């Protein structure tokens with residue numbers, strides 16, 4: 001309700017800045033996203049209101065949880081309060097692995113696969129970017145999909161359908177790309193330009209993920225990267241995989 005209900009501890013990152021905060025009433029650790037709407041038009045503020053209502057709706061263990069919205073009309077600043085994910089985002093995990101030359105555990109990849117697949121299933125059920133920067137880790141081995149998604153960069157994760165026209169199986173391809181990058185510490189198709197990239201995607205060829213990962217894990221990631229959307233496994237078919245066990249799911 002009010003900014004003064006919370007105390008900022010410090011800034012985590014800088015669409016304004018993201019800050020770790022403490023709710024005064026009970027000391028709960030949260031974060032908020034700080035947005036200056038002062039320069040926005042009425043139309044834009046209207047679709048901002050629409051977006052925020054949308055986030056207040058989705059509740060799921062594998063989706064970053066919204067708590068509150070605070071309007072500071074004096075500084076024309078809006079705060080979106082959400083849960084704190086102490087393990088940060090998946091992009092930093094991959095970069096860390098890349099820089100330090102250390103692959104991630106299969107167990108970790110299975111957790112990401114299982115929990116992101118359940119996030120997707122929920123998103124599809126309701127009607128969000130499937131990329132490492134939009135994936136967050138809490139302090140309990142849980143994985144959460146953030147709200148990014150609802151030019152300069154190469155569109156590494158774009159499916160062959162999207163690269164022409166025109167589909168939930170497209171999301172499966174994107175997940176395949178993300179899990180592939182998590183394993184290999186590089187995307188399955190790399191290139192310097194989008195046109196070069198598009199040429200590679202159309203061939204649909206890539207390296208096997210590293211041998212430290214099982215044939216079973218390689219197989220399902222490879223299936224997700226099938227050129228034909230109808231050969232990619234559905235969320236249901238993914239979760240039926242013998243690889244995926246109770247402990248790979250979320251725990252409170």
Ligand SMILES: CCOc1cc(-c2nc(-c3cc(OC)c(OC)c(OC)c3)cnc2N)ccc1C(=O)O
Nearest residue numbers: 018031064083084085086087088089092146147148
């Ligand atoms: C502008 C980003 O919006 C979101 C932020 C979070 C969110 N992020 C973190 C977080 C914590 C970190 O500390 C380790 C960290 O450094 C690696 C980090 O890097 C980006 C992020 C903690 N809690 C959070 N709730 C979640 C979702 C969003 C979003 O808008 O989807």
Ligand SMILES: [Cl-]
Nearest residue numbers: 100101102103
């Ligand atoms: Cl390595």
Ligand SMILES: [Cl-]
Nearest residue numbers: 105106107212
């Ligand atoms: Cl391993």
Ligand SMILES: [Cl-]
Nearest residue numbers: 207208209210
């Ligand atoms: Cl390899």
Ligand SMILES: [Cl-]
Nearest residue numbers: 245246247248
């Ligand atoms: Cl166990």
Ligand SMILES: [Cl-]
Nearest residue numbers: 061250251252
């Ligand atoms: Cl539960």
Ligand SMILES: [Cl-]
Nearest residue numbers: 061250251252
């Ligand atoms: Cl949870």
